Design a protein around this ligand. Structure first.
Ligand SMILES: Nc1ncnc2c1ncn2[C@@H]1O[C@H](COP(=O)(O)OP(=O)(O)O)[C@@H](O)[C@H]1O
Ligand SMILES: [Mg+2]
Ligand SMILES: [Mg+2]
Ligand SMILES: [Mg+2]
Ligand SMILES: [Mg+2]
Ligand SMILES: [Mg+2]
Ligand SMILES: [Mg+2]
Ligand SMILES: [Mg+2]
Ligand SMILES: [Mg+2]
Ligand SMILES: [Mg+2]
Ligand SMILES: [Mg+2]
Ligand SMILES: [Mg+2]
Ligand SMILES: [Mg+2]
Ligand SMILES: [Mg+2]
Ligand SMILES: [Zn+2]
Lengths: 57, 119, 124, 116, 178
RNA sequence: UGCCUCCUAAAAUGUAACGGAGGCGCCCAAAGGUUCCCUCAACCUGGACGGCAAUCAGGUGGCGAGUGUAAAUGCACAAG
RNA sequence: CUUCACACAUGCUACAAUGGCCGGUACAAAGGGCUGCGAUGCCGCGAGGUUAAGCGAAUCCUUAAAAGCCGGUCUCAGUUCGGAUCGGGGUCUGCAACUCGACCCCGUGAAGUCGGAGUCGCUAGUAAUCGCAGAUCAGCAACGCUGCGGUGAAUACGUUCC
């Protein structure tokens, strides 16, 4: 059954806006998946009432 | 685990085909045992539990046969065919051993039908 | 007929439609707009281009020149002349349903055998 | 085009299309399109990937949008309830907080008519 | 040769002999399968999951899924037995390592208002399971050519014997915890 | 009022009463024939919508599930 | 006296394209002002803050009238319609704004797609729409009331019927 029922899964290059890029295998036609946020240019991957009375006065 | 799963699953497949296939003194039973490196085979006579002939891929004649593992299954299939006829056997029943008939075992079985045994 | 959601001020707009298949042209330079809350009748002889006029509206054709414009509110329902949806070797129940008990008839869940028995197909 | 997690609707002018972000209305969207040089009368389908970097960081340095704004609105409501102020008792019952009239109106903090 | 698999047996494989004192190299944990399913409960009505719940997991994971049927009938859920209610795909081998790279590198930080994943979602043996939002995050499906939005949940099954033995393995692969 | 299962029925078979409980006047073109393959329910732990209970993942589980249909005798070697 | 499961009444703003928003540009009348009216100048995104010219006023301030006109954009959508509710930060008057003030800025963006039985006003500078001023007043819940002008209609066969 591992013949002509599964979709196209060929090699693919992914670039990011930061400049990081790598090469995996995906289903996107043309091998041109382009992201705008990745595992290095995202946050969390890289980092009272009394004090407001004093700021008023 | 998977090694403990495979032993329990193939000796349950082996018991299922054993309910209906037993084999007697004049028609013995050819029992295959297929590992990853070799295959063993013996004729068992299930009335007193007595092997009358046996052949294996671990002896020196089958070990020095060139080719893949199917060609060494053909060679051990020719040995127990010509050892059954030295004890007065010419018809047997074929025990799959729980495996699937095809590949190395069907190459053992078809190489024993060409050389005298009539199953 | 089940009632549907609220219909806007723009139902279907057709602006300068041209349609054909060969040198024979069927529809040429047609401009109209379907009203809200009315019954519209399409009149003509055979082989003149009436089912092709629907199949550009439902999105199963492609116009030659001019565009078909629907609008954001319209959910479209389309019965067909050829009865292409119904297959012969399948029972009258499990074509309406698909072996399912309850179906969607538009934001409500009526039972399927209660739905087909509302269309006369009752009992066995 | 995704900007902060909001997925702007196509064919809409950038003056108004940024107001679909929870946290930006009409006046703040006039200064997003001032500090980044993008003109007001530009459709969002022509939005350049080089342009979209310039306004995915002016917001994250100077504004407060989805998630960490909506968790400030519901936390300031949360501050008033357990300290037991007058607006906190007034939030727990669904009645208006800013001294409104409750005799013939306030059908927004309440539902429709119950009709005893 | 996928990059997450070769990075596994280059320094992740060796580092777990220091954090845990194994006496044999066969004891070192390894992720064996990643199981993804939708679980489309709104398929007991309207019978539309072939167009919508199969055409998207084929694009996300690489191979076509299996339609799962209901084991027993429930009257409160408007359900029968043998009714299509779930859609599952299993990822093994080298397509597992490419999915775990493509999930953690470019997919998982596209969750709207993402802040991490919780490290308390182990079953007791070392098998993690989280869930996602909709037919967003993966780029392979597009937002324009789809029906109603629907989410999923993803199992990760390891050979680890206990919880933190699988927590140290998925921290090294690139799951963000907190 | 005929048929089918149990108890009464006294450890073979059979056994009455206007004694005690229940089924039948069908259904299935696969729910038949054969060859191969699989183990259930319930409970517990983790999981987007999802709840006691839909689908997933892992532990535990030797028959408490299941048998088109009443009951008894069978069936996990499966007759599921 | 301001409460709130509800009910009636008088209004205001809307449900949009004879419209919304942005930029430019014309035209009033009648009033009020020393415990006041604040021109100009600077500061503030704005409410306003400060400096202070002139004036018991046909002199000075109030004073930018708004609809209108010209051009640009939005293209029929619960919206660039609508501005309720709520979160934050402010100005002002006043001993004091929590119960319980008005105004401003930012964010939020509810109902509503012209309204059932029934029912109301209006015959000409009228109705319909648009602003401005006054009285009470420290401030103001002013959308009310008393006034003022701008633009400016449609019909009246007739007394059968209420
Ligand atoms: N796929 C096609 N290719 C070429 N010609 C077609 C096709 N379908 C229909 N036609 C032609 O279009 C003409 C008009 O058909 P039409 O009037 O739309 O059918 P109906 O009478 O059902 O409305 C017919 O004469 C037919 O020959
Ligand atoms: Mg026709
Ligand atoms: Mg007896
Ligand atoms: Mg007896
Ligand atoms: Mg069969
Ligand atoms: Mg069976
Ligand atoms: Mg009073
Ligand atoms: Mg507006
Ligand atoms: Mg200034
Ligand atoms: Mg104009
Ligand atoms: Mg509504
Ligand atoms: Mg409208
Ligand atoms: Mg009169
Ligand atoms: Mg006053
Ligand atoms: Zn990056």
């Amino acid at each position: 059954m591992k013949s002509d029922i599964h979709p196209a899964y060929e090699e693919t290059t992914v670039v990011c806006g930061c400049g990081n890029t790598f090469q995996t295998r995906s289903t996107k036609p043309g091998g041109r998946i382009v992201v705008e946020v990745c595992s290095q240019c995202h946050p969390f991957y890289t980092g009272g009432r009394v004090a407001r009375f004093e700021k008023r006065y | 685990s998977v090694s403990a799963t495979r032993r329990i699953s193939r000796l349950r497949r082996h018991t299922r085909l054993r309910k209906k296939l037993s084999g007697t003194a004049e028609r013995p039973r050819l029992v295959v045992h297929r590992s990853a490196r070799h295959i063993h085979v013996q004729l068992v006579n299930d009335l007193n539990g007595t092997t009358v002939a046996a052949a294996s891929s671990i002896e020196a004649d089958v070990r020095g046969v060139p080719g893949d593992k199917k060609a060494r299954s053909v060679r051990v299939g020719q040995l127990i065919a010509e050892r059954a006829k030295a004890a007065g056997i010419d018809t047997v029943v074929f025990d799959r051993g729980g495996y699937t008939y095809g590949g190395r075992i069907a190459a053992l079985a078809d190489a024993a039908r060409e050389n005298g045994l009539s199953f | 007929i089940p009632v549907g959601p609220r219909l806007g001020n723009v139902v279907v707009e057709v602006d300068h439609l041209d349609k054909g298949y060969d040198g024979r042209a069927l529809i040429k330079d047609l401009s109209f707009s379907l009203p809200r809350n009315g019954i519209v009748g399409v009149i003509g002889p055979n082989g003149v281009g009436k089912t092709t006029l629907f199949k550009t509206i439902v999105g199963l054709e492609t116009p030659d020149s001019g565009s078909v414009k629907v609008g954001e509110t319209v959910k479209l329902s389309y019965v067909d002349q050829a009865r292409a949806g119904i297959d012969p070797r399948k029972t009258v129940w499990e074509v309406v349903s698909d072996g399912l008990d309850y179906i969607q008839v538009g934001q409500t869940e009526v039972p399927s055998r209660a739905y087909v028995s509302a269309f006369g197909f009752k009992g066995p | 085009a995704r900007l902060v997690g909001v997925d702007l609707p196509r064919d809409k002018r950038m003056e108004v299309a940024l107001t679909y972000i929870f946290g930006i209305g009409r006046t703040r969207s006039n200064e997003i399109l001032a500090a980044t040089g993008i003109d007001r009368d530009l459709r969002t389908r022509d939005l350049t990937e080089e342009q979209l970097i310039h306004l995915r960081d002016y917001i994250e340095a100077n504004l407060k949008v989805e998630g960490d704004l909506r968790r400030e609105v519901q936390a300031d409501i949360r501050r008033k309830i357990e300290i037991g102020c007058y607006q906190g008792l007034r939030h727990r019952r669904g009645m208006p907080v800013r001294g409104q009239r409750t005799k013939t109106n306030a059908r927004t903090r309440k539902g429709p008519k119950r009709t005893i | 040769q996928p990059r997450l698999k070769e990075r596994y047996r280059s320094e992740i494989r060796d580092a777990l002999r220091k954090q845990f004192g194994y006496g044999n190299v066969m004891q070192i944990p390894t992720v064996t399968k990643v199981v993804v399913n939708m679980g489309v409960g709104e398929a007991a009505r309207d019978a539309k999951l072939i167009n919508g719940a199969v055409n998207d997991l084929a694009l996300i994971t690489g191979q076509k899924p299996e339609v799962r049927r209901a084991r027993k009938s429930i009257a409160q859920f408007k359900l029968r037995e043998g009714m299509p209610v779930g859609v599952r795909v299993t990822l093994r081998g080298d397509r597992m390592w490419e999915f775990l790279d493509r999930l953690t590198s470019i997919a998982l930080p596209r969750i709207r208002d993402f802040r991490g994943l919780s490290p308390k979602q182990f079953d007791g043996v070392g098998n993690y399971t989280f869930g996602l939002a909709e037919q967003a995050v993966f780029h392979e499906v597009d937002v324009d050519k789809i029906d109603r939005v629907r989410g999923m949940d993803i199992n990760v099954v390891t050979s680890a014997a206990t919880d933190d033995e699988g927590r140290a393995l998925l921290r090294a692969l690139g799951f963000p915890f907190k």
